[PDB]
Design a protein around this ligand. Structure first.
Ligand SMILES: *[C@@H]1O[C@H](CO)[C@@H](O)[C@H](O)[C@H]1NC(C)=O
Ligand SMILES: *[C@@H]1O[C@H](CO)[C@@H](O)[C@H](O)[C@H]1NC(C)=O
Ligand SMILES: *[C@@H]1O[C@H](CO)[C@@H](O)[C@H](O)[C@H]1NC(C)=O
Ligand SMILES: *[C@@H]1O[C@H](CO)[C@@H](O)[C@H](O)[C@H]1NC(C)=O
Lengths: 189, 189, 189, 189
């Protein structure tokens, strides 16, 4: 199967651009796109591209999972197995959620830290992201006694200083994210 | 991942200039630029640069968060991991807030100093910066008569003499700052 | 260079359908499409296809001249030379001209037959096509009372019986044709 | 030096698109663009691109000669020699010239054929193009006793059937071409 990455970023703001770049050593660098998740995009249905494919400008419809088969002319199907799943995320669609820290943004080593995303928007899911990590954490949003939709991320004992932002998303659109929270720098002393 | 910095300062006055610099040890100093909080200005759109890159004059449209990947030819992605956050803040957009100290400009060593940023403008976030330390503090504004918005930065024990300034910014654009407040030098006896 | 053809016909009625086909012996049947007389319709913009490609329904925006390069991976350009001209003409846009024969529908073998296309419309170019022969003839229109535009196609000696039709087209759009004239069968005794 | 080609066509209609694709075996596929001829384009001045560079939409300012240096980090200049000159042509800017044949579009083998481009537009140069040949012929436009600017291409004795089109261009813009002539099919019997 081919190796497909997003350049320069899989996480792209609304109105931005992204290039789906694929490489295939077995066969040739002629690929066919496949959008698995997200809003249906007809102009992406069985679309054949060379080396790379430029999505611009990026709309909320482009958020979702993509896969690519490489041209392998001397195989039974003349096309290869699907590539690695490539998830494209679109941000800056809804109001940004507020991010706060318990007990506070500054705590000692070995102390449990728990972040909270809050919003007046009826987000179904909250996505916490840390600067440095590409692995995003996602938790369901639960209503509070204030009229806000909230989720609490328990990070556990502190090991080193980090910086967090969070996003909100409605049902049926997990990759269509809101504006990012203001950066919350967790300092570990 | 590459090391990116803004020079002479990430906090750059409108009409001023800034240089996006980056250095990459593991590979080659060919860097691709991308903005995370919105679509970039045209001369920053699809921008790959060599070593450093000069922006002049600086406009409000340059304010935001940026990342860079260094050229890593012999890797799956042919590019490095996202660099350290490359933030650009533009000042001089709104009238400067007033900065006051508590208990005052001169204080005893080990005593608590609290700096209040206050304006008639309806800022959402005040930012307290210090001379010599490229580390800004963020706080939300609060209403209080006489029809003013205010934020109190408690710095804890005062160890050494330090001069401060503060900027006002509105809710939808946290990287677009007001004119700098008059400098407040705190002396420590 | 690849061989490209339109099927069932390059002369295709508006609202009708056409299939762009191509075959490439020297390399692979992966073809890139491009229009030479203007920017292409969106589903033809950045269009790479496998073997053949179906257009339905056909709109006036599809009319024009096209080329195709077959996939030639192990060459400097990684693509072939431009194919044979792939022309699309759309009919049914204007009222049909009237087609007349000289001396008439039935003629002696070896005699000269001249076909006049005539309309009240101010066409710039008349196009004479024949049933069975995928080769159209082009001629400019000429003013003459009763306030009509006309073109005379001299076919020379009449060898065999053949049915003709003609289309009118205006100066700025030579690939956008009128409705077909009533068929004129020429008999040869 | 790198090998740089235009995809899918160096000859691109106004409002169209073209991709400057470069390959470099010695060093890496990081290139820097250079526009030698044509109208000055600042956003193309020392612009660094990866693998390919997409010009879209194409304007008359993009017509001209391009060269590319490849990234060769362990060389005295860290960049290589300029690539092959890549001429990009923009068509469909002015009215199309008329193309006629002397003595006629149909002649016997070994007969001298001479084409003529005519126009009411003050073209300084006429460019004859043949279907199949990438080599364009250019002749200066000379005024006639009719008020038209004309040029005569003497092709000499006929060898095989061909198809010709022609373009017109004004002074100082040799690669900014008009609309193509109607195709003139020279038949050789
Ligand atoms: C963090 O939570 C875990 C689980 O309840 C607990 O075992 C641990 O003692 C806590 N750490 C601190 C510093 O409170
Ligand atoms: C001074 O600040 C320190 C740290 O912020 C705090 O522990 C202390 O209680 C404060 N004292 C007063 C009098 O506010
Ligand atoms: C008939 O047509 C042929 C070829 O076009 C021409 O040589 C001949 O002179 C014509 N005869 C008449 C009577 O028009
Ligand atoms: C074509 O022109 C050349 C040069 O004048 C001449 O030698 C030749 O005989 C001409 N051919 C014909 C068929 O007239």
């Amino acid at each position: 199967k081919p190796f497909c990455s997003a350049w320069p970023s899989a996480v792209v703001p609304q109105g931005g651009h992204v290039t789906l770049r694929c490489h295939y050593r077995r066969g040739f660098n002629i690929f066919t796109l496949y959008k698995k998740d997200g809003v249906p995009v007809p102009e992406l249905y069985n679309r054949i591209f060379w080396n790379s494919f430029l999505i611009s400008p990026v709309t909320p419809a482009h958020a979702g999972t993509y896969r690519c088969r490489g041209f392998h002319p001397h195989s039974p199907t003349e096309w290869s197995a699907p590539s690695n799943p490539l998830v494209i995320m679109v941000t800056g669609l809804y109001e940004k959620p507020s991010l706060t820290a318990r007990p506070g943004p500054t705590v000692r080593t070995g102390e449990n830290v728990t972040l909270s995303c809050s919003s007046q928007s009826s987000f179904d899911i909250y996505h916490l992201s840390r600067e440095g990590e590409a692995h995003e954490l996602r938790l369901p949003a639960v209503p509070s006694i204030n009229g806000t939709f909230q989720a609490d991320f328990p990070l556990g004992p502190a090991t080193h200083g980090e910086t967090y932002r969070c996003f909100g998303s409605f049902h049926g659109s997990p990759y269509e994210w809101s504006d990012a929270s203001d950066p919350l720098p967790v300092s570990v002393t």
